[model samples]
Target: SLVDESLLVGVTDEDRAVRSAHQFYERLIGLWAPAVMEAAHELGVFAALAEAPADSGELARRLDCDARAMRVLLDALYAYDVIDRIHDTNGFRYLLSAEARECLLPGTLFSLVGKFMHDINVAWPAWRNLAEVVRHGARDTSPNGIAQEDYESLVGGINFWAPPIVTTLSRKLRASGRSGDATASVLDVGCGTGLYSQLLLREFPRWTATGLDVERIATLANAQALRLGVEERFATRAGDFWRGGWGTGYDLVLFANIFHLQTPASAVRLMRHAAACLAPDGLVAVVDQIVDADREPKTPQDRFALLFAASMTNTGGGDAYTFQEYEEWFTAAGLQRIETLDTPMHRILLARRAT
Candidate 1:
């Protein structure tokens, strides 16, 4: 934060933005936004606001809740963009936002309302155990890196991130100057939902992908392959990645969202495995937070990656690794980074077997 003079200069006015603008306040109050949204859902606040815009009191009276308490919820919701605020006179009224409708309305493809539901049950407990993890080193020390039960609940919601990532990956591959092989083969390690590989298959009709992960996660990947109409080219193997069964001669190996979850030893192990499975001219695409080798992040993806690193470890043992650190892993794995592509929330590193 040498970049932010106010932070160095001691709490200047620019550093005083409320929860919405200030990074510190933004993260702290973030816990409140979801809580308020969940409460509003339970209290039928969304339906009332969607039915007709109304002041906090009117909505509270109709919904049978305390007026002042309702006002607090509405104001917080307005700040979170769950609801819109209308004001000129007659006091501001609350109305459901389009963003809220697509997500909170339920049944939408991108709906994260299930996240709200799952958070109350699984996610909260997972992070709640995080305190225990940090305190006693029990949960975070799990060799599995994360609990399967937790992964099952959380993995589905992340497919939303796959589209852009997959799209960016496809473009990067095509832009690599290496012509797309008519029969390119891909091996997707720990391919949860298999969306990235499946989407890549859709992009390159001649290419085929084989995904490997546990049975439950592998099944999810195959299902999406069918849904995406790439099942004919996309296949899955349900098994442990640490064990054998990764076929060799793969043109491209994908490790999307897989690296950050690994402990250091395991992280290096994965790279070596990728090298063993790779063809002489093969590529390994790592889609994760690749932080700057020496300094803080300046780009959008880098910024998100640093925060993402904290978010990852707060729940597990994995970390957001710097490019310098990744280079060491790559070299140890007998591979070398050739290029990097910046995507939203994460970055992609394209590497090749060392000559």
Candidate 2:
């Protein structure tokens, strides 16, 4: 039996060893962390910890979880480095990690716990059909016992509230001599929450911005404009970039972290739309994670692509595009490549619309 077991799965065998190593990461981190975080958040563990650290008994009372079951999750959080254990005058206590405090606290720019819960609650279950989605190459669009309206609202809320993921792109735009110009009129397509709009408004007070997204996000966009006191400099337009009218003759158009959310055909069509909306001598920027053709070791960008792809999959049918794919799409859209930005989690594909 020992000899057979060794033959079946042994360290001496290279293939079996490699499979086992991969399985460890696949199960422990990928499969385990999501389920654990989802359950803990649903049970109010993080919220309870935010106020004060409690023993298993106090935690159970506040969160109404079974004490025994609650301990299981508490241990997991400690194991995952999300929380730390320390001994105070009151005895042992768990505290939120700096990472957690910054990113998961109730009110902060980087706070995403609300968004995280929304995604896990609504979209995680939808991803059960991932295999089916792969086979069909689009969303299942069937009732998965989750209300479509509620899911859409949650998704829209998350996208609208989270901080803009385009700071690096904005910095690069400044470096490219578009910074201090009244001549530049910026158009942001599918501009949810208007975070990038706010950034641009803050940076280049002279630049006029027209932000386009669904009407659902207009309230948030307007609020951002008012908050920044840039209401006079920015305009919000409600329309679909895919099917609605996009006004042309802008100095710069931005598609920030948006191209990877669709299939190749849809993404290319978006480029074409950008081209059609550009002014003579206008610049276009596509900000997104670009994979390599070989699908390996694209540095920090590769890690973000994996996480973004998984998050998008959980949310819906979004996929990351390769650099080669972008090259083809940009050229086909009648844009000439001029520069690429050195940004983390994104590559700013700078091009000019062909006359």
Candidate 3:
């Protein structure tokens, strides 16, 4: 579907040339779009439009920005379909598009300003250094290691993307008959904000979780658990998972978005450790963007895998590995009967030890 040769039929050479030029410039335009969005967000344009349609001057006055700049910014947003422009007696009025109101308005559940700002201000710099990273290998230490604020942003971003995927995963697990009874326990390693654990607890009322992460993240995860009213069924441990003790006999052990931050050897060791902590029939779930065997990406998701792999490299970690690589790691870790659960973005590699 991504490579539809039929679409190219009847296209002249001149037409192809023009199309190519259009695509090139479209990509170039993309470079400035985010900055425009950030500026508009900072100027509270979304909120202003959310309240009601307004002329650029009125928007500027309300948001305390330069009227001329606001006009330019509003025009850009209109071009992007983030806002709609209406012709009126005063010339033009801008209003938030339905999608923008739902996704960008402050009170909405999908409001993404925090995560957007974090990516623009924090992650963008690291991405800019990609050329240097490719020239030399990844640094021994991450140039932008996880700080408290960054971690907060990471949690927020994850939460924003989690709901749909989590619901799908829970339903699938139920269909597969893995929705354990009250006795089942989960060990969510490097759990971050404990989103998966919280979702699982909500899905299977009887299942409980013990999340482990660094001190700050663990504390945040605990707070989130309480906020979600799952604190009674959820607990957290703060420590380095590599050196720290993990209480044994978990029915499920999860390593979500963890392996990319590790070398193959380290990942194998971590999987082995997870195996050691599992019950006899326990499952190990590795959720990540896995690549094809040749490490070449084809689809949009494949592109994301490549980009994230680059990001992982820039942040001092191994790039995204192929599914074959993961299977090898699982085998080395003494896990058998590997299977996959496909999600919109990432794949879940589910494995278990033989009886």
Candidate 4:
């Protein structure tokens, strides 16, 4: 009877409770809307409208997309409130909503999110291998696999290839002697596409930035520099930070969002490498998510931890870290912890080379 009540009917209280419990998944489904908008952006729907609003057919012609497929994509966009559906003399036209133009438009600081979404989609399938990843304890498809390549491509094309916010931040820190940046040169270890490099250049106009990553991503880093008009100030090279030369005489080095992508040993190794690269008066900035060090998990961060942790499992063996772990690593690396700045989805940990 219990089984029947739970599985077949809501005649009993327990049955009704089971049905109510199922409602939580509907909330989960709502999370998919952002991905839909990202797909539309990648398909050029938003950019096309930024140029001129047109009905589905005309939009398809311009984008060289099949008319029928365009309608499906447009309908999804309409449902998601990304565009306004209008009926004028020419028929139904979809116009970009004000919000889209402000954030998703080309040349906007946030315009690279579409690239992020695209990369997410590519990595989405990897999540299906979660059970295997857990059992094997590897970073990617193989037991000893590493996701350096995939991560490299995504970070370079999306973050490093976009703006110069990192360089700008460094410049400000150097002059003020505030959040790190007390030395001369700066290094962005695991500088995937050099997103932090741009910020450094912008903040520390006079300082030089070195970005290290796969050689293949040099082009993207170069393109980002050209777009921000800071090519002269930024430099990049191909080398693995874990085993490669860190090149001493740097005042500050950045390790942004790198901890969560590797095992604890790897994270410690990176911190050690950063310590070695710093000048005597150098500083290190670690921008990453600060998980619940205490038992009480932050609600929003807790939910994100699920997706973030799960996604990492799919890609490889990366795991989200806690504040306590970061402190220990910094201390072990012969650095003094200074401060941690509040970044968008990360905490920028600032430390200095041991005097």
lDDT of 4 by residue, 250-271 (tens): 8778877677876778778788
- Pairing residues by index, what is the TM-score of model 4? 0.78
Residues 242-303, candidate 2, lDDT per residue (tens digit)?
A: 66577888888888767877678877888888888888778888877777777785588776
Better of 2 and 4 by lDDT: 2
- Full ranking by TM-score: 3, 2, 4, 1
How well is each residue in 1-355 modelled by candidate 1, as lDDT tens digits?
1134354343556544432255565456667777898788779888678778899899989999999999998898887666898985788888867766665655444456556666766566677666666676524342253555555545665767888888888877887654555689999998877878888887888899999988777777787788889989999988788887799999999998889988778889889999999987899999998788654779888788887776676665477888888889999999999988788788889899888
Worst 10 residues of 1 by lDDT: 1-10
Per-candidate Cα lDDT values, in order, are 0.79, 0.70, 0.78, 0.68
In candidate 3, which residue ranges exceed 4 Å CA deviation?
Answer: 1-18, 47-54, 83-102, 105-111, 139-148
* Prediction 1 global C-alpha lDDT: 0.79
Task: Give the per-residue Cα lDDT of candidate 3 at 105.
Answer: 62
Q: TM-score for candidate 3, please give it.
A: 0.85
Quote each prediction's TM-score: 0.76, 0.78, 0.85, 0.78
Each prediction's RMSD to truth = 5.4, 5.4, 3.9, 6.0
Q: Is candidate 1 or candidate 3 better by TM-score?
A: 3
Q: After superposition, how far is residue 134 of candidate 3 from its true place, in Å?
A: 1.2
Model 4 misplacement above 4 A: 1-19, 31-35, 38-44, 61-69, 87-90, 97-109, 112-121, 139-149, 156-183, 299-303
